[PDB]
Design a protein around this ligand. Structure first.
Ligand SMILES: CCCCCCCCOS(=O)(=O)[O-]
Ligand SMILES: [Ca+2]
Ligand SMILES: [Cl-]
Length: 124
């Protein structure tokens, strides 16, 4: 679930402001996205959007009727270490990892204020 995603990011990147920070960033961090990613971070989101694309096409998520951001799952945090609990079932585990990997990715990609609120129509 999205709330869990924001929570997950706040775990891997402490003083973070997930939504303020990762929405409308680059050409992929946000609703949808196209064009060439603008940097390592924008790439993290491209990967995340593909992971969510596979998720819906996953047999294990056949009963999930909406966007993966509505799929709730089970994760824990410890020392900015994100764990996807084994109690998660197929679809959840999967979606949990799309998120986890994204948080980790986000925490290791440079952040360039210039790529925030980028003009998509003009550069994507
Ligand atoms: C352009 C941003 C769209 C998504 C905004 C946040 C939607 C979810 O809000 S939440 O259910 O408390 O995690
Ligand atoms: Ca996106
Ligand atoms: Cl995204």
């Amino acid at each position: 679930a999205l709330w869990q995603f924001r929570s997950m990011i706040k775990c891997a990147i402490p003083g973070s402001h997930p939504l303020m920070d990762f929405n409308n960033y680059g050409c992929y961090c946000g609703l949808g996205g196209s064009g060439t990613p603008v940097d390592e971070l924008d790439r993290c989101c491209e990967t995340h959007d593909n992971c969510y694309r596979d998720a819906k096409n996953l047999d294990s998520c056949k009963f999930l009727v909406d966007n993966p951001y509505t799929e709730s799952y089970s994760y824990s945090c410890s020392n900015t270490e994100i764990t996807c609990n084994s109690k998660n079932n197929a679809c959840e585990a999967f979606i949990c990892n799309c998120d986890r990997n994204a948080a980790i990715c986000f925490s290791k990609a440079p952040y360039n204020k210039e790529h925030k609120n980028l003009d998509t129509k003009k550069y994507c």
